[PDB]
Amino acid sequence: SSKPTDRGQQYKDGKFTQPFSLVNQPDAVGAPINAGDFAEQINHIRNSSPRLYGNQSNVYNAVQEWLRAGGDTRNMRQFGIDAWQMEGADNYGNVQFTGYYTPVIQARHTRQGEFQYPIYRMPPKRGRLSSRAEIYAGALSDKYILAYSNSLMDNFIMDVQGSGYIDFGDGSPLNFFSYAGKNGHAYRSIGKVIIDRGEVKKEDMSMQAIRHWGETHSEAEVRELLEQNPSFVFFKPQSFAPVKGASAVPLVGRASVASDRSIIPPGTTLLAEVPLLDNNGKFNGQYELRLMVALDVGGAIKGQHFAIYQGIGPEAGHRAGWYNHYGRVWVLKTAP
């Protein structure tokens, strides 16, 4: 018998042969520890997607009533809540949990250390003529610099997206910057370049592939590559815009996940025992009972697999990085 337990896998609920198994009562003790966050998450659905809210409020309401009353898994029945245990990837109830987050651009107000890569606001017409290479070489006046970032590649991802969040590190709130304009040069595919060079395989090309490539190469190498795209993007300050997933609903850290729309539709409520990790990123045998809502999707997120949205910034990125563990999940539904 081969039953590994190094990644959080457990084998105390027997074998499952159906995608969803209705349980008398979840094999989980205590109450969810993220009630507050869950309430905030539901509110976001009520305000940002009234159509989805109206389709799942029966579940949200029942769950909320259960939580205020105590939140003990042994008392869910009286609220009409049914718990459907997921089979897991190994058919033993072990569901795959990865992590994901919203990256932030670290920046400073003046050139210093690694922060040598300026992000610009719209310059006058004449200044807009310069190609990327020329701007890199100092074509634009310093007065149009919005911030000095520590990553040329991150600046390019931002160019493609059209917006991004900048963290100046001074404790102030995150600054959101949105599309303001562009230079006079047509863009060229950076993805295409690293493909024709045999750096990345055609099927592996994604924004994350380009992002990762920049992290493992020198700025000199990144600059050389980036210069192949003469287009350049200009930005403007914008009032904060909360991060939304594919359901167009603002995501709340560790209270929302990305899931397979085929087996777990958006708005679906999840009760999960999430494996706890330390600073090193290792499973210590401890679990966390959380309530989460499927509000996003992904290309590599299919089947008995959930990607827990960790939030925004470096801390969230650390958690989202070393996350590839297993836990138990019960879909909560109201008895028809």
Curated annotation (Swiss-Prot):
Instruction: Tell me a GO biological process for this protein.
Output: peptidoglycan turnover
Q: Name one GO cellular component term.
A: outer membrane-bounded periplasmic space
Q: Name one GO molecular function term.
A: hydrolase activity, hydrolyzing O-glycosyl compounds
Q: Which PROSITE patterns match?
A: PROKAR_LIPOPROTEIN (PS51257)
Recorded hits in SUPFAM superfamilies, A to Z, give: Barwin-like endoglucanases
Q: How does activity depend on pH?
A: Optimum pH is 4.0-4.5.
| One matching Pfam family | 3D
Which keywords does UniProt give here?
Cell outer membrane, Cell wall biogenesis/degradation, Lipoprotein, Lyase, Membrane, Palmitate, Signal
Q: What is the protein's membrane topology class?
A: Lipid-anchor
Enzyme category, top tier: lyase
Keyword Cell wall biogenesis/degradation set for record: yes
What's the stated role of this polypeptide?
Murein-degrading enzyme. May play a role in recycling of muropeptides during cell elongation and/or cell division. Degrades murein glycan strands and insoluble, high-molecular weight murein sacculi.
Tell me the protein's name: Membrane-bound lytic murein transglycosylase A
Q: Which organism is it from?
A: Escherichia coli (strain K12)
**Taxonomic lineage of the native organism:** Bacteria, Pseudomonadati, Pseudomonadota, Gammaproteobacteria, Enterobacterales
Which gene underlies this protein?
Answer: mltA
